[PDB]
């Protein structure tokens, strides 16, 4: 096959890395993240968690090519609050929110062994 195999679209290699920590060389106090082997499934929820937080000034994400698998995150916050803690507190709020959704999901499905009516 001329194209890549079916497992290359998600499985990384021995010389490639996942997230990459890179700082910006323009605005003061900023970082430009780079996550490899990922589409728009994860990049859309990172911007939503940083937009609701009023401690974030700028937040965006793009891809170098849609056929490939690579996303980057450029976040800019206040000069007092470090941008590294903004992405860290955002990944912990999403896991805690999805954990409570599964707990309430198991109670509703187990509250009607015979029927609601």
């Amino acid at each position: 096959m001329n194209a890549p195999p079916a497992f290359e679209s998600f499985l990384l290699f021995e010389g490639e890395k996942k997230i990459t920590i890179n700082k910006d060389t323009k605005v003061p106090n900023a970082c430009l993240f780079t996550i490899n082997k990922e589409d728009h499934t994860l990049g859309n929820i990172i911007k939503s968690q940083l937009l609701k937080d009023p401690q974030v000034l700028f937040a965006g994400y793009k891809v170098p090519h849609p056929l490939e698998h690579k996303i980057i995150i450029r976040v800019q916050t206040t000069p007092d609050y470090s941008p590294q803690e903004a992405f860290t507190n955002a990944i912990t709020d999403l896991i805690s929110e999805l954990s409570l959704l599964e707990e309430r999901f198991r109670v509703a499905i187990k509250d009607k062994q015979e029927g609601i009516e």
């Binding site: 001329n2 194209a3 090519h65 849609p66």
Partner: protein
């Protein structure tokens, strides 16, 4: 004969000086891609 090979009727003029073959080339099927730049041409993996 000898004149036909040089006159031009598919001889050493039209078939060589005016129409020969070169090396290092590729010719596939073009596909639209507005996401690329104005100079980023497509290069297949099998051709590379």
């Amino acid at each position: 004969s000898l004149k036909q090979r040089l006159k031009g009727k598919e001889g050493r003029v039209r078939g060589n000086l005016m129409g020969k073959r070169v090396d290092f080339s590729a010719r596939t099927v073009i596909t639209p891609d507005p996401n690329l730049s104005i100079d980023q041409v497509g290069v297949p993996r099998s051709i590379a």
